[PDB]
Ligand binder design. Structure first.
Ligand code: MN
Length: 118
């Protein structure tokens, strides 16, 4: 679909993403501030896509990807990374992420990835 669950501990970052995802025609299923919170809302919300930050408190993105992958082996997760987070990117993808997006955000590339993932 086009209902995106946004997860990032940085509010600024969520809002920005949120702005892009909308202008692009997607829909904001909801948000989450950590890995545990993510897994939860994945469960309630059942979104079509998840954008997942890597460095977060309580549970990291990888932790939470694994979890979700447990709940839903068909989950569609895109991981957001800072530059120089190349290894964890690899890891998240090995974990099950479909793609990755860098921060700060390049909208064209955000949209592209999202489109690909659908
Ligand atoms: Mn973070």
């Amino acid at each position: 679909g086009k209902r995106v669950l946004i997860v990032d501990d940085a509010a600024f970052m969520r809002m920005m993403l949120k702005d892009i995802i909308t202008k692009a025609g997607y829909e904001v299923a909801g948000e989450a501030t950590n890995g545990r919170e993510a897994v939860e809302k994945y469960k309630e919300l059942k979104p079509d896509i998840v954008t997942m930050d890597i460095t977060m408190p309580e549970m990291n993105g990888i932790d939470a990807i694994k979890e979700i992958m447990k709940i839903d082996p068909n989950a569609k997760i895109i991981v957001c990374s800072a530059m120089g987070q190349q290894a964890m990117v690899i890891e998240a993808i090995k974990a099950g992420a479909k793609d990755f997006i860098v921060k700060p955000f390049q909208p064209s590339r955000v949209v592209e990835a999202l489109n690909k993932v659908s």
